[PDB]
Amino acid sequence: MTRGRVIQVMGPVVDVKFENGHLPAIYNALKIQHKARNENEVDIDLTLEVALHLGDDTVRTIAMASTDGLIRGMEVIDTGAPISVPVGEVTLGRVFNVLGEPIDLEGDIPADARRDPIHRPAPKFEELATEVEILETGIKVVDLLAPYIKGGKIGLFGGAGVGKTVLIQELIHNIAQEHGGISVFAGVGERTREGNDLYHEMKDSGVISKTAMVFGQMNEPPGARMRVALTGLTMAEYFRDEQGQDVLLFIDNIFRFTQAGSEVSALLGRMPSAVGYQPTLATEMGQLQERITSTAKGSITSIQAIYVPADDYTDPAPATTFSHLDATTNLERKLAEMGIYPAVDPLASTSRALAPEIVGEEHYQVARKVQQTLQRYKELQDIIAILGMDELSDEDKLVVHRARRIQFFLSQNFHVAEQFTGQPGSYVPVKETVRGFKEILEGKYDHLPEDAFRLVGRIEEVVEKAKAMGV
Template sequence: MARAATQTSPAAGKVTQVIGAVVDVKFDGVLPPILNALETENGGHRLILEVAQHLGENVVRTIAMDSTEGLVRGQPVSDTGAPISVPVGDETLGRILNVIGEPVDELGPVTTTARRAIHQPAPEYVEQSTESQILVTGIKVVDLLAPYAKGGKIGLFGGAGVGKTVLIMELINNVAKAHGGYSVFAGVGERTREGNDLYHEMIESKVNVDPHENGGSAAGSKCALVYGQMNEPPGARARVALTGLTIAEDFRDKGQDVLFFVDNIFRFTQAGSEVSALLGRIPSAVGYQPTLATDMGALQERITTTNKGSITSVQAIYVPADDLTDPAPATSFAHLDATTVLNRSIAEKGIYPAVDPLDSTSRMLDPMVVGEEHYEVARKVQSTLQRYKSLQDIIAILGMDELSEDDKIAVARARKIERFLSQPFHVAEIFTGSPGKLVSLEDTIKGFKGLVNGDYDHMPEAAFYMVGSMDEAIEKAKKLAAVAA
């Protein structure tokens, strides 16, 4: 019978079958354990294979972390004796790494001996911290209606092209800059161009150090980047989120408050689904892998705050065909402290960020956490918007004139609230031509309190569109009045 290999005796085997990203390897007598990393040569490059199944007859089925083009049967493979491990610590800051921790930024090797396996158990219950503190983002709609928890998990849900990546970039801009601590960004199956843009934006905004001005070194940077983008094979996309998380966990365990950004969690699920079919598993609902909830749980349970430090995680989650009941986004809902749902119908009105104020939720919106005033204003804003939503069919059929006076006032206020929830972003300045605005929580609450109480009923709707605080809206109203006169 085959025995599992120990770390002292690295086993040697050979490739017996290659089907896309899945490679079968036969060993003579000693089998490497599940999740162990195997190593082979492919076109002069080191190729890592991760053991996924033991098939019997001394054969293991593995997932390739890079392209398998050029692999041939009979090729020698050696067991590394351990799971995939990646470099961790301060030396990773300012660097771009791939799924196996190799640098892809042409700045030479990562000079650290500290490494950590990408597969780790989640922290024990006794290690976890439960305090509730708000993370202020400077984005009105988020801070007012679905505030983020410091050390919590936040999901940005949206279909294609409604602004998930722009919102995550703005959060990096607002939070990572003001935060001053360390950040880790995991690019999972998204556009390489956006990854490149983000790297250069981080240098421009001084979050990271420009190595060309620093003698080829990125020392002094605040953010590590880990990429496994759209062009990578599914094995890399299924593991790159774990690589980024491993680097973030190391900072957390050293007492840091870390920001962990993932764009996009759906691609993690999608890659798992691609690999699952090749591994011979029978698909589950909508063609996803039968282990969907397990895979998601294994990742999400590790993203947590402990007594040593915190990980605040912001995850963009693509919603296929704008269907929130799709198993992939639906599975991630259960793990999140706050959900920010982006809606195409709001984007079509030209209101950005296109956050749905009625669909977005947060467990932090509780008077015990945010205070009585904030809670009351948020609930009034939501009830006004809900009333407008329920009257929209009547307005579409009969027009505004058929509404009662009370309803007319509610609709007018709701339309102003809708526009005041829009905000120009720093990262979108080049597209919009408007300078970005960061609004304090006090100004946000004050502005919306005045709106729901009717203090600004005399101002035109246009004054509230794409401004920061209420003072700017008042200024804009004066300018509009002057132009009209």
């Protein structure tokens, strides 16, 4: 027979014993359906995933929901296949959970719909593409110091309470409304209020007609938090694999996946790692990251947000994900506290597209000059903090004078922040910002006060702000 019994319950981990010679394979799905016999029992409907083989016809599994009410000796049914999620044109405009069940209260999906397994191997070496081109976003810092790549990987690093949600919402508003393709959103391990607001905004804007969403949000157990991302990826891959259409993807927070993995690995019997993580941290992340690539059939562009615990950039989880990205942006609490938004570090951020033959000689020279001036200004902080500005030479004073103006001009005002301040916001082209930075570097605007460069947008508005102030 293909039915087992429950042996041990240890929270999110359940043990099942099967008949000899009929053990299920790894990554299969098991179903438990029980009805109460008397007043001291509760109805149960739950699913499990196979993880390890312990020998003696024993299987170690992981639960996808709360395990309260389980009793030793219950019956288990084996399906013989991994988790399957419906995919196709039906998924457009709907909201799904970890198991592919709609939660939008718009009806059910017919049982004849095509569905695909979640687990699959990575694409081969010879099927990849390496074309590079620049994608424009409309933000001065990103467009100048770390251009994005169409069809690559982009990651955002930041701490707690630094302003990542505003930045990602601004990116969605600027890019998603004119992509002209297919968009997929994942909400792994984040707030429910943000998801509800995003859903209502999409409904109001009408973009929801060509997108799908899988949330699996913060309150869900680690079993679901480890599979939401895989469900979203297997939903996204079908379009570019069977139609060759351009796909744009978002991931809400990838750190919660590794956090849930570390939480689960403790009860499986593995020895702790250096900082208490699982021993298999690298391979588990690599298997997922290597699956998001652009091939000859189609291209996929993705934007990911990564959480930095306790503002420590040397933590293993943030440190091991740097080798998978192409362009990175870093947020700093020190810059955030000074009133500079979106508080992007100009020296830590890097990109692969910053080349003379890709962007342009003038842009390359301007960026290099700005970085050099910023570094030279940074080198004088120790002397400035103690001995003041009096002991500096003539060149250092001018360097500081222009560095302050550049640092203040690097800020910008967004459309989303209008509801809190009343300022409409602006959209700045690459040529405009390059010309403005070149003019600033040339020393044309050395007579204006530094307070006129804050949240101004284009260069021409600086003059009108100064004359409104009274200069």
